[PDB]
Protein backbone atom coordinates (compact mmCIF):
# COMPACT_ATOMS: atom_id res chain seq x y z
CA UNK A 1 0.00 0.00 0.00
CA UNK A 2 3.00 2.63 0.13
CA UNK A 3 4.87 3.59 -2.74
CA UNK A 4 5.40 5.42 -5.87
CA UNK A 5 2.01 3.62 -7.51
CA UNK A 6 0.56 2.44 -4.51
CA UNK A 7 -2.32 4.08 -2.28
CA UNK A 8 0.12 5.88 -0.13
CA UNK A 9 3.30 7.92 -1.16
CA UNK A 10 6.23 8.13 1.80
CA UNK A 11 6.87 11.48 2.46
CA UNK A 12 9.20 10.75 5.27
CA UNK A 13 10.12 7.97 8.19
CA UNK A 14 8.61 9.38 11.39
CA UNK A 15 9.36 6.34 13.70
CA UNK A 16 10.28 2.96 14.49
CA UNK A 17 7.68 0.98 16.99
CA UNK A 18 7.90 -1.94 18.62
CA UNK A 19 6.27 -3.80 15.72
CA UNK A 20 7.49 -1.88 12.50
CA UNK A 21 8.27 1.06 10.91
CA UNK A 22 5.86 4.54 10.79
CA UNK A 23 5.98 6.99 7.92
CA UNK A 24 4.49 10.18 7.12
CA UNK A 25 2.46 9.50 3.95
CA UNK A 26 0.22 10.89 1.38
CA UNK A 27 -3.14 9.01 0.00
CA UNK A 28 -3.18 9.57 -3.85
CA UNK A 29 -6.79 9.85 -3.44
CA UNK A 30 -7.88 11.63 -0.99
CA UNK A 31 -5.22 14.19 -0.18
CA UNK A 32 -4.66 12.85 3.54
CA UNK A 33 -1.75 13.09 5.26
CA UNK A 34 -1.93 9.88 7.16
CA UNK A 35 0.73 8.01 9.49
CA UNK A 36 1.00 4.14 7.91
CA UNK A 37 2.71 1.61 10.48
CA UNK A 38 3.72 -1.20 8.54
CA UNK A 39 4.05 -4.35 10.32
CA UNK A 40 5.87 -7.79 8.61
CA UNK A 41 -2.02 -14.57 12.10
CA UNK A 42 -6.03 -14.10 11.99
CA UNK A 43 -7.12 -13.61 15.09
CA UNK A 44 -4.88 -10.86 15.60
CA UNK A 45 -6.31 -9.19 11.73
CA UNK A 46 -9.92 -9.71 13.77
CA UNK A 47 -8.89 -7.91 17.52
CA UNK A 48 -7.44 -4.87 15.39
CA UNK A 49 -9.53 -4.64 13.12
CA UNK A 50 -12.15 -3.80 15.86
CA UNK A 51 -10.61 -0.73 17.06
CA UNK A 52 -11.86 1.05 14.27
CA UNK A 53 -14.85 1.93 15.91
CA UNK A 54 -12.73 3.11 19.71
CA UNK A 55 -12.60 6.79 18.83
CA UNK A 56 -12.29 9.05 21.07
CA UNK A 57 -11.04 12.71 20.70
CA UNK A 58 -7.47 11.47 23.14
CA UNK A 59 -7.28 8.25 21.64
CA UNK A 60 -5.43 8.69 18.08
CA UNK A 61 -7.64 7.93 15.16
CA UNK A 62 -7.41 4.57 13.64
CA UNK A 63 -8.38 4.86 9.56
CA UNK A 64 -7.42 1.80 8.15
CA UNK A 65 -6.31 -1.58 8.90
CA UNK A 66 -4.92 -3.53 5.92
CA UNK A 67 -3.82 -6.65 5.43
CA UNK A 68 -2.10 -7.30 1.86
CA UNK A 69 0.90 -9.05 0.63
CA UNK A 70 1.80 -11.04 4.38
CA UNK A 71 2.05 -7.71 5.78
CA UNK A 72 -0.28 -5.70 8.43
CA UNK A 73 -0.43 -1.89 8.16
CA UNK A 74 -2.21 0.24 10.11
CA UNK A 75 -3.48 3.90 8.96
CA UNK A 76 -3.64 6.84 11.24
CA UNK A 77 -4.37 10.34 11.64
CA UNK A 78 -1.02 12.55 11.59
CA UNK A 79 -0.04 15.16 14.21
CA UNK A 80 2.96 16.77 15.53
CA UNK A 81 5.14 14.95 17.32
CA UNK A 82 5.46 12.12 20.40
CA UNK A 83 5.58 13.34 24.00
CA UNK A 84 8.95 12.55 24.12
CA UNK A 85 10.53 14.81 21.99
CA UNK A 86 8.23 17.76 23.46
CA UNK A 87 9.62 16.29 26.54
CA UNK A 88 13.18 16.73 24.93
CA UNK A 89 12.61 19.89 23.47
CA UNK A 90 11.42 21.28 26.72
CA UNK A 91 14.16 19.96 28.93
CA UNK A 92 15.80 23.73 29.93
CA UNK A 93 12.90 24.86 30.99
CA UNK A 94 10.88 21.78 31.69
CA UNK A 95 6.33 21.49 30.48
CA UNK A 96 4.91 24.23 32.35
CA UNK A 97 2.75 22.51 35.20
CA UNK A 98 -0.73 23.60 33.63
CA UNK A 99 0.05 21.90 30.20
CA UNK A 100 1.45 18.68 32.42
CA UNK A 101 -1.75 19.35 33.81
CA UNK A 102 -3.83 19.56 30.90
CA UNK A 103 -2.22 16.23 29.26
CA UNK A 104 -2.43 14.14 32.39
CA UNK A 105 -6.22 15.29 32.50
CA UNK A 106 -6.45 14.19 28.68
CA UNK A 107 -4.93 11.05 28.69
CA UNK A 108 -6.90 10.15 31.65
CA UNK A 109 -10.31 10.75 29.59
CA UNK A 110 -8.89 8.54 26.74
CA UNK A 111 -7.97 5.56 29.16
CA UNK A 112 -11.15 6.25 31.12
CA UNK A 113 -12.87 5.76 27.08
CA UNK A 114 -11.12 2.82 26.15
CA UNK A 115 -11.46 1.21 29.44
CA UNK A 116 -15.25 1.39 29.22
CA UNK A 117 -15.15 -0.55 26.11
CA UNK A 118 -12.74 -3.07 27.67
CA UNK A 119 -10.07 -2.53 25.97
CA UNK A 120 -6.32 -1.77 27.69
CA UNK A 121 -3.25 -0.81 25.96
CA UNK A 122 -0.47 -2.76 28.04
CA UNK A 123 2.67 -0.79 26.98
CA UNK A 124 2.10 3.37 27.43
CA UNK A 125 4.92 5.20 27.23
CA UNK A 126 5.67 9.12 26.43
CA UNK A 127 6.83 7.48 22.29
CA UNK A 128 3.33 6.45 22.23
CA UNK A 129 1.72 9.55 23.32
CA UNK A 130 1.00 12.27 20.72
CA UNK A 131 0.65 15.98 20.51
CA UNK A 132 -0.80 18.14 18.53
CA UNK A 133 -0.06 22.31 17.86
CA UNK A 134 -3.21 23.33 19.60
CA UNK A 135 -2.62 21.75 23.41
CA UNK A 136 -4.23 18.14 22.62
CA UNK A 137 -2.53 14.68 23.43
CA UNK A 138 -3.65 11.66 21.88
CA UNK A 139 -2.87 7.97 23.10
CA UNK A 140 -1.39 5.72 20.29
CA UNK A 141 -1.40 2.01 20.08
CA UNK A 142 -4.05 0.94 22.11
CA UNK A 143 -5.35 -2.57 21.81
CA UNK A 144 -1.98 -3.96 19.94
CA UNK A 145 -0.61 -5.08 23.18
CA UNK A 146 -3.18 -7.96 23.17
CA UNK A 147 -3.09 -8.62 19.40
CA UNK A 148 0.30 -9.32 19.38
CA UNK A 149 1.92 -9.74 23.27
CA UNK A 150 5.08 -7.26 24.22
CA UNK A 151 8.53 -8.57 23.14
CA UNK A 152 11.76 -8.52 24.88
CA UNK A 153 12.95 -6.54 21.79
CA UNK A 154 11.54 -4.83 18.85
CA UNK A 155 11.90 -5.59 14.68
CA UNK A 156 14.84 -3.74 14.76
CA UNK A 157 16.28 -5.63 18.16
CA UNK A 158 15.95 -2.46 19.70
CA UNK A 159 15.34 -2.57 23.77
CA UNK A 160 11.12 -2.33 24.61
CA UNK A 161 11.65 -0.18 27.49
CA UNK A 162 10.51 -1.57 30.71
CA UNK A 163 10.41 2.34 32.54
CA UNK A 164 6.57 2.14 33.08
CA UNK A 165 5.81 -1.31 33.34
CA UNK A 166 3.27 -2.22 36.23
CA UNK A 167 4.89 -4.56 39.22
CA UNK A 168 2.48 -7.32 38.86
CA UNK A 169 3.38 -7.33 35.36
CA UNK A 170 7.20 -7.83 36.11
CA UNK A 171 5.84 -10.11 39.46
CA UNK A 172 4.62 -12.64 36.81
CA UNK A 173 1.00 -12.22 37.08
CA UNK A 174 -1.14 -14.17 34.83
CA UNK A 175 -3.89 -11.65 34.66
CA UNK A 176 -3.68 -7.89 33.94
CA UNK A 177 -6.22 -5.45 34.65
CA UNK A 178 -7.25 -1.64 33.28
CA UNK A 179 -4.99 -0.72 36.46
CA UNK A 180 -1.49 -1.22 34.39
CA UNK A 181 -2.21 1.83 32.08
CA UNK A 182 -2.71 3.74 34.74
CA UNK A 183 0.40 2.54 36.32
CA UNK A 184 2.47 3.49 33.13
CA UNK A 185 0.19 7.27 33.14
CA UNK A 186 1.31 7.73 36.39
CA UNK A 187 5.38 7.28 35.33
CA UNK A 188 4.47 9.30 32.82
CA UNK A 189 3.47 12.26 34.81
CA UNK A 190 5.95 11.97 36.96
CA UNK A 191 8.44 12.09 34.18
CA UNK A 192 6.80 15.00 32.75
CA UNK A 193 7.16 16.97 36.42
CA UNK A 194 10.70 16.21 37.16
CA UNK A 195 12.15 16.23 33.96
CA UNK A 196 13.20 12.62 34.52
CA UNK A 197 12.32 9.42 34.17
CA UNK A 198 10.87 7.64 37.42
CA UNK A 199 11.82 4.28 37.71
CA UNK A 200 14.46 3.91 34.77
CA UNK A 201 15.28 0.27 35.15
CA UNK A 202 17.44 -1.92 32.93
CA UNK A 203 16.68 -5.00 33.29
CA UNK A 204 13.20 -6.63 34.74
CA UNK A 205 15.21 -6.96 38.21
CA UNK A 206 16.74 -3.57 37.92
CA UNK A 207 12.65 -2.46 37.26
CA UNK A 208 11.55 -4.14 40.09
CA UNK A 209 14.61 -3.31 43.04
CA UNK A 210 13.77 0.85 41.42
CA UNK A 211 9.97 0.60 42.23
CA UNK A 212 10.73 -1.50 45.84
CA UNK A 213 13.39 1.61 46.51
CA UNK A 214 11.03 4.46 46.14
CA UNK A 215 7.46 2.86 46.91
CA UNK A 216 9.10 -0.10 49.71
CA UNK A 217 9.17 -3.38 48.92
CA UNK A 218 5.93 -4.38 49.22
CA UNK A 219 4.34 -7.20 50.92
CA UNK A 220 1.11 -8.84 52.09
CA UNK A 221 -0.22 -5.29 54.36
CA UNK A 222 -0.05 -3.38 51.36
CA UNK A 223 -0.60 -6.17 48.24
CA UNK A 224 -2.70 -9.61 49.17
CA UNK A 225 -1.20 -11.89 47.49
CA UNK A 226 2.13 -10.42 46.65
CA UNK A 227 4.27 -13.15 48.12
CA UNK A 228 2.46 -15.60 46.00
CA UNK A 229 3.02 -14.26 42.84
CA UNK A 230 5.00 -16.46 40.24
CA UNK A 231 8.02 -14.22 40.06
CA UNK A 232 7.99 -12.94 43.78
CA UNK A 233 11.45 -14.12 45.66
CA UNK A 234 11.51 -13.93 49.67
CA UNK A 235 14.70 -13.12 49.73
CA UNK A 236 14.07 -9.60 47.42
CA UNK A 237 16.30 -6.96 49.68
CA UNK A 238 13.57 -5.14 52.14
CA UNK A 239 13.30 -1.34 51.46
CA UNK A 240 11.51 1.29 53.34
CA UNK A 241 9.12 3.54 51.38
CA UNK A 242 10.24 6.95 50.36
CA UNK A 243 8.09 10.11 50.86
CA UNK A 244 6.58 11.41 47.86
CA UNK A 245 7.46 14.98 49.03
CA UNK A 246 11.18 13.80 47.94
CA UNK A 247 9.98 11.72 44.52
CA UNK A 248 7.87 14.52 42.42
CA UNK A 249 8.95 17.61 44.17
CA UNK A 250 7.54 20.61 43.09
CA UNK A 251 4.25 18.87 42.81
CA UNK A 252 1.35 20.93 44.68
CA UNK A 253 -0.46 18.00 47.48
CA UNK A 254 -3.52 17.89 44.86
CA UNK A 255 -0.98 16.12 42.33
CA UNK A 256 1.01 14.28 45.27
CA UNK A 257 -2.07 12.45 46.54
CA UNK A 258 -3.56 11.61 42.88
CA UNK A 259 0.44 10.06 41.85
CA UNK A 260 0.39 8.47 45.39
CA UNK A 261 -3.01 6.65 44.06
CA UNK A 262 -2.24 5.64 40.90
CA UNK A 263 1.41 3.87 41.76
CA UNK A 264 -0.65 2.05 44.97
CA UNK A 265 0.82 -1.54 44.27
CA UNK A 266 -2.07 -3.67 44.47
CA UNK A 267 -3.96 -3.06 41.15
CA UNK A 268 -7.44 -3.52 42.77
CA UNK A 269 -6.03 -0.12 45.11
CA UNK A 270 -4.91 1.35 42.15
CA UNK A 271 -7.65 4.40 40.95
CA UNK A 272 -9.23 4.21 37.92
CA UNK A 273 -9.15 6.82 35.41
CA UNK A 274 -12.66 7.53 35.90
CA UNK A 275 -11.91 8.67 39.33
CA UNK A 276 -8.82 9.98 39.02
CA UNK A 277 -10.84 12.82 36.53
CA UNK A 278 -12.82 13.38 39.67
CA UNK A 279 -9.74 14.33 41.48
CA UNK A 280 -9.34 17.90 43.00
CA UNK A 281 -6.05 18.49 41.07
CA UNK A 282 -8.09 18.74 38.46
CA UNK A 283 -10.47 21.29 39.86
CA UNK A 284 -8.28 24.04 37.84
CA UNK A 285 -7.59 22.14 34.81
CA UNK A 286 -7.14 24.44 31.47
CA UNK A 287 -6.07 23.69 27.83
CA UNK A 288 -2.95 25.50 27.26
CA UNK A 289 -1.09 26.12 23.94
CA UNK A 290 2.20 24.55 24.27
CA UNK A 291 5.16 26.58 23.22
CA UNK A 292 6.37 24.83 19.88
C1 LIG B 1 -0.84 4.26 12.61
C2 LIG B 1 0.43 5.04 13.07
C3 LIG B 1 0.86 4.61 14.50
O1 LIG B 1 0.69 3.42 14.76
N1 LIG B 1 1.40 5.43 15.50
C4 LIG B 1 2.17 4.84 16.67
C5 LIG B 1 3.17 5.87 17.21
C6 LIG B 1 3.90 6.53 16.03
C7 LIG B 1 2.82 7.41 15.44
C8 LIG B 1 3.03 8.76 15.12
C9 LIG B 1 1.94 9.51 14.62
C10 LIG B 1 2.17 10.95 14.32
O2 LIG B 1 1.21 11.69 14.06
O3 LIG B 1 3.49 11.55 14.43
C11 LIG B 1 3.21 12.99 14.48
C12 LIG B 1 0.62 8.98 14.45
C13 LIG B 1 0.43 7.63 14.77
C14 LIG B 1 1.46 6.83 15.26
Known sequence: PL?????????????????????????????????????????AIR????????????????????????KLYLVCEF??????????????????????????????????????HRVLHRDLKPQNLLINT???????????????????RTYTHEVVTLWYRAPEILLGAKYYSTAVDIWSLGCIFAEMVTRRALFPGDSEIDQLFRIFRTLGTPDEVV????????????????????????VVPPLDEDGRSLLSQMLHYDPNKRISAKAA????????????????
Request: proline share 7%; hydrophobic share 40%; net charge positive.
Open 223 to 246: WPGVTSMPDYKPSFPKWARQDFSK
Open 79 to 116: LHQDLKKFMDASALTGIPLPLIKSYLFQLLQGLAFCHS
Open 3 to 43: GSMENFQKVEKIGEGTYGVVYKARNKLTGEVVALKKIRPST
Open 47 to 70: EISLLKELNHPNIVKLLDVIHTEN
Open 277 to 292: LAHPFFQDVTKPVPHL
Open 134 to 152: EGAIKLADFGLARAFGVPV
